[PDB]
Design an enzyme around this catalytic site. Structure first.
Site, PDB file in Angstrom:
ATOM      1  N   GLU A  50       0.649  -1.169  -0.137  1.00 39.62           N
ATOM      2  CA  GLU A  50      -0.069   0.031   0.009  1.00 39.62           C
ATOM      3  C   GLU A  50       0.884   1.152   0.028  1.00 39.62           C
ATOM      4  O   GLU A  50       1.948   1.198   0.744  1.00 39.62           O
ATOM      5  CB  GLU A  50      -1.007  -0.004   1.208  1.00 39.62           C
ATOM      6  CG  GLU A  50      -0.267  -0.051   2.469  1.00 39.62           C
ATOM      7  CD  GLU A  50      -1.161  -0.012   3.765  1.00 39.62           C
ATOM      8  OE1 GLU A  50      -2.442  -0.183   3.414  1.00 39.62           O
ATOM      9  OE2 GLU A  50      -0.678   0.390   4.985  1.00 39.62           O
TER      10      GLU A  50
ATOM     11  N   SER B 168       6.867  -8.131  10.429  1.00 36.45           N
ATOM     12  CA  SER B 168       6.228  -8.491  11.502  1.00 36.45           C
ATOM     13  C   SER B 168       5.870 -10.102  11.166  1.00 36.45           C
ATOM     14  O   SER B 168       6.291 -10.686  10.334  1.00 36.45           O
ATOM     15  CB  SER B 168       4.827  -7.765  11.455  1.00 36.45           C
ATOM     16  OG  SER B 168       4.974  -6.344  11.491  1.00 36.45           O
TER      17      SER B 168
ATOM     18  N   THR C  65      -3.177  -7.618  17.966  1.00 34.36           N
ATOM     19  CA  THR C  65      -3.780  -6.437  17.441  1.00 34.36           C
ATOM     20  C   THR C  65      -4.640  -7.026  16.214  1.00 34.36           C
ATOM     21  O   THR C  65      -5.777  -6.725  15.866  1.00 34.36           O
ATOM     22  CB  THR C  65      -2.882  -5.506  16.726  1.00 34.36           C
ATOM     23  OG1 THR C  65      -2.321  -4.992  17.909  1.00 34.36           O
ATOM     24  CG2 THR C  65      -3.429  -4.371  16.220  1.00 34.36           C
TER      25      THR C  65
ATOM     26  N   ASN D  90      10.681   1.788  17.800  1.00 36.45           N
ATOM     27  CA  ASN D  90      11.756   2.160  16.893  1.00 36.45           C
ATOM     28  C   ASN D  90      12.954   2.847  17.168  1.00 36.45           C
ATOM     29  O   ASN D  90      14.074   2.214  16.677  1.00 36.45           O
ATOM     30  CB  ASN D  90      10.806   2.899  15.553  1.00 36.45           C
ATOM     31  CG  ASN D  90       9.589   2.458  15.236  1.00 36.45           C
ATOM     32  OD1 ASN D  90       9.440   1.089  15.213  1.00 36.45           O
ATOM     33  ND2 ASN D  90       8.874   3.067  14.664  1.00 36.45           N
TER      34      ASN D  90
ATOM     35  N   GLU E  48      30.094 -14.239  11.385  1.00 32.92           N
ATOM     36  CA  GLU E  48      30.631 -15.022  12.476  1.00 32.92           C
ATOM     37  C   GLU E  48      29.280 -15.173  13.349  1.00 32.92           C
ATOM     38  O   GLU E  48      29.291 -15.969  14.263  1.00 32.92           O
ATOM     39  CB  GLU E  48      31.541 -14.192  13.247  1.00 32.92           C
ATOM     40  CG  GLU E  48      33.226 -13.975  12.692  1.00 32.92           C
ATOM     41  CD  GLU E  48      34.017 -15.366  12.623  1.00 32.92           C
ATOM     42  OE1 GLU E  48      33.886 -15.960  13.628  1.00 32.92           O
ATOM     43  OE2 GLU E  48      34.486 -15.448  11.713  1.00 32.92           O
TER      44      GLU E  48
HETATM   45  N1  GTP Z   1       7.149  -2.562  17.220  1.00 32.90           N
HETATM   46  C1  GTP Z   1       6.497  -1.906  16.139  1.00 32.90           C
HETATM   47  N2  GTP Z   1       5.636  -2.628  15.591  1.00 32.90           N
HETATM   48  C2  GTP Z   1       4.829  -2.179  14.462  1.00 32.90           C
HETATM   49  C3  GTP Z   1       5.072  -0.814  14.290  1.00 32.90           C
HETATM   50  N3  GTP Z   1       4.211  -0.786  13.349  1.00 32.90           N
HETATM   51  C4  GTP Z   1       3.498  -1.765  13.185  1.00 32.90           C
HETATM   52  N4  GTP Z   1       3.933  -2.640  13.954  1.00 32.90           N
HETATM   53  C5  GTP Z   1       3.555  -4.165  13.739  1.00 32.90           C
HETATM   54  O1  GTP Z   1       2.874  -4.453  12.219  1.00 32.90           O
HETATM   55  C6  GTP Z   1       1.830  -5.043  12.281  1.00 32.90           C
HETATM   56  C7  GTP Z   1       0.978  -4.448  11.263  1.00 32.90           C
HETATM   57  O2  GTP Z   1       0.807  -5.437  10.161  1.00 32.90           O
HETATM   58  P1  GTP Z   1       1.647  -5.237   9.000  1.00 32.90           P
HETATM   59  O3  GTP Z   1       3.344  -5.789   9.442  1.00 32.90           O
HETATM   60  O4  GTP Z   1       1.864  -3.883   8.524  1.00 32.90           O
HETATM   61  O5  GTP Z   1       1.043  -6.027   7.725  1.00 32.90           O
HETATM   62  P2  GTP Z   1       0.429  -5.049   6.694  1.00 32.90           P
HETATM   63  O6  GTP Z   1       1.120  -4.593   5.566  1.00 32.90           O
HETATM   64  O7  GTP Z   1      -0.612  -4.270   7.231  1.00 32.90           O
HETATM   65  O8  GTP Z   1      -0.641  -6.421   5.940  1.00 32.90           O
HETATM   66  P3  GTP Z   1      -1.850  -6.899   6.765  1.00 32.90           P
HETATM   67  O9  GTP Z   1      -1.308  -7.457   8.000  1.00 32.90           O
HETATM   68  O10 GTP Z   1      -2.463  -8.187   6.136  1.00 32.90           O
HETATM   69  O11 GTP Z   1      -2.879  -5.774   7.063  1.00 32.90           O
HETATM   70  C8  GTP Z   1       1.258  -4.898  13.794  1.00 32.90           C
HETATM   71  O12 GTP Z   1       0.732  -6.351  14.200  1.00 32.90           O
HETATM   72  C9  GTP Z   1       2.116  -4.273  14.653  1.00 32.90           C
HETATM   73  O13 GTP Z   1       2.444  -5.110  15.834  1.00 32.90           O
HETATM   74  C10 GTP Z   1       5.854  -0.179  15.105  1.00 32.90           C
HETATM   75  O14 GTP Z   1       6.120   0.966  14.714  1.00 32.90           O
HETATM   76  N5  GTP Z   1       6.747  -0.816  16.091  1.00 32.90           N
END
Ligand code: GTP
Ligand code: GDP
Ligand code: ADP
Ligand code: MG
Lengths: 365, 428, 427, 376
Positions: free
Chosen positions: B62, B131, B170, B219, B245
């Protein structure tokens, strides 16, 4: 006057033709009746086998009027096939562990005689299919084994009920070509010795392998009456119980310790075809299971458990009763076992001795 | 130069990379334009003109977050053609990211990464951030991992995936994506470092003492972790350790390649004054279960290996004393067959704190790359959640209708079960 | 750029869509003319999803107005934000359904479906990558049901990849506005369970409770009632139209919300609903929004969730907040209300925190609950439908239009299956 | 010799007329008995089916070709006639997949031919002769033997040629029972979740609709239902479907091997004398290939092809677990086959597997869920 002669000349010809086609069509349907009947035999046998084994059946009987002041046990009912019993003595309740026994079906003191005959009706057809059947009533003295088998005139047992069903099918089967002859032998196994219940002429009796089937057993010198109708067999059973010399009044041990074997051999012969059947039902009323001879009772315990284990050798000739039922304990046939239990604390130690035999059946099968 | 490149898939990956590259350009005095008013050559392909282009490949299905980074202060920093954008998100689906949009942009992304690789003189490895519950971060990540294993294989593929938190999910369909991507990445990722959101939330609660933690702070912490990891390449130290290593030191077996990261100096500015920040105390702190970046109890499981990365004014004698004291500790359990795994990454380049951040100026920092038995229960409960989803066949219709079969779900579940069996037989 | 096509069926649907478009224009700072005058460039970033580009820096809604009584849109056209629509979009008949789904789906529908289909294709091909269609209508009348049942059946068979948004207004349980709304509703849901994949059930009776009790309003005008729906519906797509920490969209919630294709009926919910003078007494933080949006007092539908279990819960947030609070609070309600949640879906909460709040507000929450409490509403309709079925009340109006009586059995039977699934999954 | 012939043949009239009445009365009795005689086994046979099944799973492993036997094949182990064990030769597959043992009702050896399948025909047609909605399913991957057992080859015919031959001679026996059986042939195709007609080339709109008599009875509007008059006429009906279903099966794998063909033979038996009507139906249904979707050219509908298999797998599991609601309407195939899947109806579940190593994984997927049926 010659005109009417010609008119009945063709009438004779047409009635010969109509009946010839009527009979020829009849025989084709008649043969279809025979082939339709024989498949029903296997289906009934198959259902019994698919059900597994028709053993492991417990029947709890209610206390009598003279047994109202006796102390009972805690009867726990689970679904409809498992029953649990616990002693009212809480001191021993924590020491008994799990007195749980699972049966194929559970009969409670509110079950009528017709309920038991529901599982006894299908095997009657299997007996008509040339298969050997047996009904075993087992338990301690006073459990109700005689009531299950013989019963009372008000509520008849399996023996009066099997005859009524047996003859009802036989007359209906008359349209199916087969002709049946019923042979009744009434015998008592007192202590490794065979006694005839149809004659007071004391002789010696021995068991030998059959002349036409080495796996079959016939009893020598036994009185083998041809049953004509339910009235005849009812008279025959009345003679057997009177000749049994019921010494319950004085010396009940003699009458109780003796096993009561009722053998009813069904023979089916079909003319214009081929059919050989020697299927028999052995309505054996077993003796008391109380601890102390017990050669027949102990061997019957071992033989049944060995069969479920698919043991290579079965000690059939290790007792008279087991060897009497050597052809009546085969693989292809189906076996039933009734476990009558007294709902009393004084019989609680005897009640568990009647039920762990079944607990050793399903765990072995 | 043993240069390396990084990949960013999913909103998590893009945000993490934004903060990371911000920290990176802060380290070497690189302006947001791309010039500095050698050491940086590993991650910056600086041309003759003053534009230190990062070796970053940002990809998303996206255009939202990529447009955001194209709107921030770093739009001119990144090469515009690097940022690859889709049109529709994978929508929590491994199915979408692996079959329906993944292969419709994988050609472009592989072409871009190949162009980057041919630009590099000596290739070091691969970095990916994503993720598990993320549809992109599962499907696209697994597809890219297997593609790179086919293409190169011999190179170093390192995963900085984020773990699904034990108590909060989430995305309601996180277990499916997690299990599928683990099954399809187990045999294609050299080493996959683990980090959990709930654990870092607790850390910033009780250590940073911040009551309103945003994704920015998470982050920042992840950027500090990656900076500690890459300091040995970007800077000189007493004992420099490269990504090559790491696989030798950490993984005993090909399947067991899931270490968890840890960062000891996570105190705030106010608490900095009350402590001297000695080597021994921070070394003990990095072994505290409350300081672990993954929601698990290391006290409950034995350790397999411990990779320690030190940066700043640190003396090897102090490190040796600290590790000797830790060897004498009781609660710190270990397996017998590898009783000497404490490879050190000592360096003398102090970490730099971003302006407006939450960390304080710390002279010495240590990054604990623990590999232990404390993740077996997490895998067991993740598989339990997967079994709960699969028992009623809930949500299975979407995945069977957009790229797979429930038979493949059974395959992934039994593969995770076999991984658990291997983990527990190694533990004993 | 994941554009969305808007279709409005029935006069109720037209009024709700007018309110929705006016609040959307308020979000993007668009005059009645179409000239942009806002300040945030983020509005221009996703202005395409609802507004088509027009010459001279103007914008027109990507909306299709469908009706059978021309007067309704005349008020819409004469009213503010009426000329903002491109006049070609106004497609209508002349006869009128007259609260008869029979007319709106077989005779008036057949002659008019072609007229609206072409302009749909014209708008569909005017997009880069179409995301889905949103339908605003009601289940009470005929125009809002006959058009919707036909169109959703039509649109699905040539756009199977796309998603369908049906904002059906479920008939009120007590304050009935139509003697035969069971007939419209029961026949309506027949196509709904076959074609669309997400439906938002809204009840005026509960909506009356929100304004009268929660908002303590005294004059529940439909403009106010539609305002809550419009505000609720805009929050569903703000993650698509605006950036945020977790940028979601209709596709994100599509897979999350429905465990199974048929169970796609949800209860909308908007958290911030402070009364006229209670805003001073109430602090505005993440906590207060959490429990307020999880009350049966606040559900847009007229069903008490405590009678069933939440199969799936969505929570879209607007404004500036730290997602740690929404993290544990969603966890918090997940523990206290464990009876209200299905056991075999642990952690059944979806979060879609955005960045830009509604104008005039700081934080906003949209609640999309796929609880099992819907089945009590269906049986209420099922009882009402079967009450007037075997007595054949008003049957001649429907039967005489050219449909068999067994067709009424189909809708009753099919919807009964929908009922049976909820209690089965409730245990 | 004329006056005496008058009395003698008048006596002959009485002798024959008495025999006419003697044979007539018991002819009704024998016909009456035969109905209950067939009715007794009618309820006896399904009881045999019920105790051992009513959802019957059968597995057949096809023999490799003369050149494909040298090709790598996973080891086949038969513990007994009901359990089959397949093991991947690859050591890495052994370490992760481990032992792959599965239990079914019966295991078919590659040399079993169609003898035991025809041995299963007699019990299943009897259920059809009992007026029961009986359905068979041909599940498996492409080339695993689904087409070899359903349609067959000229030297060894499949289930469809064997069923038709045995069905026709069976109803001839019931014609002697006073039963007139009307058999209706219905052919339809489910591709892209939209129904077609095999017997008609015209593109007509098909929709699933419940029958007027009962909700549980299902029909499809505007179908070309043909009244069967003779076997050769019926044989031509199935033959006409093959060239109408002309598409890539192995060369391109475009529509065939990814398609669901439903062949329903609705039998309507009637007895004029006893006003008894017996209604039954057989469902000779073959299933689509369960291969993972890798053909990206048209991968979208392959998922719907997988959806029908997945929903069907969901449906059969719901039957075993005594689930109150069964999602029949989630897919067209399940909704149409709802009468033959629920209640007293009985389902044969036939799965086809390939012995080669490359098909070991797809074979495992076929076995595990089929074995899951036997587990419950
Ligand atoms: N630690 C951390 N995790 C994040 C952050 N932003 C998003 N996430 C993780 O990313 C996940 C969101 O899904 P995405 O990895 O973006 O997958 P997507 O591109 O949205 O595709 P779909 O999951 O099908 O909607 C959430 O479960 C969060 O846990 C961030 O800024 N910090
Ligand atoms: N919220 C809201 N609901 C309305 C409005 N107007 C009508 N309705 C609802 O819509 C129903 C009327 O049916 P409708 O579909 O508009 O009739 P049709 O257009 O002829 O098909 C009634 O039950 C009302 O509850 C409105 O302005 N606001
Ligand atoms: N269900 C019953 N109802 C009433 N009386 C019973 C019942 N079962 C057994 N009895 C009593 O038990 C007596 C039969 O003795 P029984 O216990 O059968 O001898 P055994 O100890 O050999 O089994 C009968 O006189 C009868 O009154
Ligand atoms: Mg006795």
């Amino acid at each position: 006057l010659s005109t009417e002669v010609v008119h009945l000349r063709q009438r004779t010809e047409e009635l010969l033709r109509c009946n010839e086609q009527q009979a020829a069509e009849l025989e084709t349907c008649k043969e279809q009746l025979f082939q339709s009947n024989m498949e029903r035999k296997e289906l009934h046998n198959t259902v019994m086998d698919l059900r597994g084994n028709i053993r492991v059946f417990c029947r709890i009987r209610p206390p009598l009027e003279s047994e109202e002041n006796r102390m009972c046990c805690t009867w726990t009912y689970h679904d409809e096939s498992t029953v649990e019993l616990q002693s009212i003595d809480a001191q021993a309740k924590s020491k008994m562990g799990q007195q749980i026994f699972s049966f194929d079906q559970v009969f409670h003191p509110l079950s009528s005689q017709s309920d038991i005959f529901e599982m006894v009706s299908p095997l009657i057809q299997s007996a008509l299919d040339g298969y050997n059947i047996c009904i075993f009533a087992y338990g301690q003295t006073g459990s109700g084994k005689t009531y299950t088998m013989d019963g009372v005139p008000e509520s008849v047992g399996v023996i009066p009920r099997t005859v009524d069903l047996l003859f009802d099918s036989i007359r209906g089967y008359r349209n199916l070509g087969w002709e049946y002859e019923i042979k009744a032998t009434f015998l008592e196994i007192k202590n490794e010795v065979l006694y005839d219940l149809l004659s007071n002429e004391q002789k010696d009796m021995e068991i030998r392998m059959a002349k036409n089937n080495k796996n079959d057993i016939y009893v020598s010198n036994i009185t083998e009456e041809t049953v004509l109708d339910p009235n005849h067999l009812r008279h025959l059973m009345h003679t057997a119980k009177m000749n049994r010399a019921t010494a319950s009044t004085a010396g009940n041990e003699r009458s109780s310790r003796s096993h009561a074997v009722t053998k009813l051999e069904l023979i089916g012969r079909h003319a214009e075809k081929q059919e050989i059947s020697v299927g028999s039902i052995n309505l054996v009323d077993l003796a008391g299971s109380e601890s102390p001879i017990n050669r027949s009772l102990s061997e019957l315990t071992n033989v049944i458990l060995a069969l479920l284990q698919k043991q290579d050798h079965i000690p059939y000739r290790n007792s008279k009763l087991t060897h009497l039922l050597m052809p009546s304990l085969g693989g292809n046939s189906k076996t039933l076992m009734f476990i009558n239990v007294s709902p009393f604390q004084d019989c609680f130690q005897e009640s568990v001795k009647s039920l762990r035999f079944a607990a050793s059946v399903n765990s072995c099968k | 130069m043993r240069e390396c490149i990084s990949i960013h898939v999913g909103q998590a990956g893009v945000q993490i990379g934004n903060a990371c590259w911000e920290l990176y350009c802060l380290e070497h005095g690189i302006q947001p334009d791309g010039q500095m008013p050698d050491s940086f050559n590993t991650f910056f392909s600086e041309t003759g003109a003053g534009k230190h282009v990062p070796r970053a490949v940002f990809v998303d299905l996206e255009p939202t977050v990529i447009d955001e980074v194209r709107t921030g202060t770093y739009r001119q920093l990144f090469h515009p053609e690097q940022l690859i954008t889709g049109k529709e998100d994978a929508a929590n689906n491994y199915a979408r990211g692996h079959y329906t949009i993944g292969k419709e942009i994988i050609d472009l992304v592989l072409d871009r990464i190949r162009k980057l690789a041919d630009q590099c003189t000596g290739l070091q490895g691969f970095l990916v951030f994503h993720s598990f519950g993320g549809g992109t971060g599962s499907g696209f990540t697994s597809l890219l991992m297997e593609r790179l294993s086919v293409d190169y294989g011999k190179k170093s593929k390192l995963e900085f995936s984020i773990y699904p938190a034990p108590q909060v999910s989430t995305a309601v369909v996180e277990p499916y994506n997690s299990i599928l991507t683990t099954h399809t990445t187990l045999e294609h990722s050299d080493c996959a470092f683990m980090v959990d959101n709930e654990a870092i939330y607790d850390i910033c609660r009780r250590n940073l003492d911040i009551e309103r933690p945003t994704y920015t702070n998470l982050n920042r912490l992840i950027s500090q972790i990656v900076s500690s990891i890459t300091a040995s390449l970007r800077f000189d130290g007493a004992l420099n350790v490269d990504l090559t290593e790491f696989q030798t030191n950490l993984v005993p077996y090909p399947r067991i390649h899931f270490p968890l990261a840890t960062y000891a100096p996570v105190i705030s500015a106010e608490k900095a004054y009350h402590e001297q920040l000695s080597v021994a105390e921070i070394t003990n702190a990095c072994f505290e279960p409350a300081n672990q970046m993954v929601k698990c109890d290391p006290r409950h499981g034995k350790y397999m290996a411990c990779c320690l990365l030190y940066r700043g004014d640190v003396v090897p004698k102090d490190v040796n004393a600290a590790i000797a004291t830790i060897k004498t500790k009781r609660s710190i359990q270990f397996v017998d067959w590898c009783p000497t795994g404490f490879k050190v990454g000592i360096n003398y380049q102090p970490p730099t704190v971003v302006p407006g951040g939450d960390l304080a100026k710390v002279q010495r920092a240590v990054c604990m790359l623990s590999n232990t038995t404390a993740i077996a229960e997490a895998w067991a409960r993740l598989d339990h959640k997967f079994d709960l989803m699969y028992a009623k066949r809930a949500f299975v219709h979407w995945y069977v209708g957009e790229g797979m079969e429930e038979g493949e779900f059974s395959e992934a579940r039994e593969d995770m079960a076999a991984l658990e069996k291997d983990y527990e037989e190694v533990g004993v | 750029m994941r554009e969305i096509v808007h279709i409005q069926a029935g006069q109720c649907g037209n009024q709700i869509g007018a309110k929705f478009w006016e609040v959307i224009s308020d979000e993007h700072g668009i005059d009645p003319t179409g000239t942009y005058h806002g300040d945030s460039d983020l509005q221009l970033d996703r202005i395409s999803v609802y507004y088509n580009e027009a010459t001279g820096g103007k914008y027109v809604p990507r909306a299709i107005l469908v009706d059978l009584e021309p007067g309704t849109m005349d008020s819409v056209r004469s009213g503010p934000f009426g000329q903002i629509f491109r006049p070609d979009n106004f497609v209508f008949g002349q006869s009128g359904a007259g609260n008869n789904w029979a007319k709106g789906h077989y005779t008036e529908g057949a002659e008019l479906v072609d007229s609206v289909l072409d302009v749909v294709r014209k708008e569909a091909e005017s997009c880069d990558c179409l995301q889905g269609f949103q339908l605003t209508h009601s289940l009470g009348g005929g125009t809002g049901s006959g058009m919707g049942t036909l169109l959703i059946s039509k649109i699905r068979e040539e756009y199977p990849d796309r998603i369908m948004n049906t904002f059906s207004v479920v008939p009120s349980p007590k304050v009935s506005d139509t003697v035969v709304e069971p007939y419209n509703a029961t026949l309506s849901v027949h196509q709904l369970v076959e074609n669309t994949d997400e439906t938002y059930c809204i009840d005026n009776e509960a909506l009356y409770d929100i304004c009268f009790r929660t908002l303590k309003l005294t004059t529940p005008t439909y403009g106010d009632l539609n305002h809550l729906v419009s505000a609720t519906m805009s929050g569903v797509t703000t993650c698509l139209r605006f950036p945020g920490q977790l940028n979601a969209d209709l596709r994100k919630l599509a897979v999350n919300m429905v465990p199974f294709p048929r169970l796609h009926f949800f209860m909308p919910g908007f958290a911030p609903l402070t009364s006229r003078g209670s805003q001073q007494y109430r602090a505005l933080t993440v906590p207060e929004l959490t429990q307020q949006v999880f009350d049966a007092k606040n559900m847009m539908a007229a069903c008490d969730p405590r009678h069933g279990r939440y199969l799936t819960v969505a929570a879209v947030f607007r404004g500036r907040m730290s997602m740690k609070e929404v993290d544990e609070q969603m966890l918090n309600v997940q523990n206290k209300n464990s009876s209200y949640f299905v056991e075999w879906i642990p952690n059944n909460v979806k979060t879609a925190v955005c960045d830009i709040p509604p104008r005039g507000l700081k934080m906003a929450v949209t609640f999309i609950g796929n609880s099992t409490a819907i089945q009590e509403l269906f049986k209420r309709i099922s009882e009402q439908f079967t009450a007037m079925f075997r007595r054949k009340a008003f049957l001649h109006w429907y039967t005489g239009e050219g449909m068999d009586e067994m067709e009424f059995t189909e809708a009753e039977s099919n919807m009964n299956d929908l009922v049976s699934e909820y209690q089965q999954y409730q245990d």
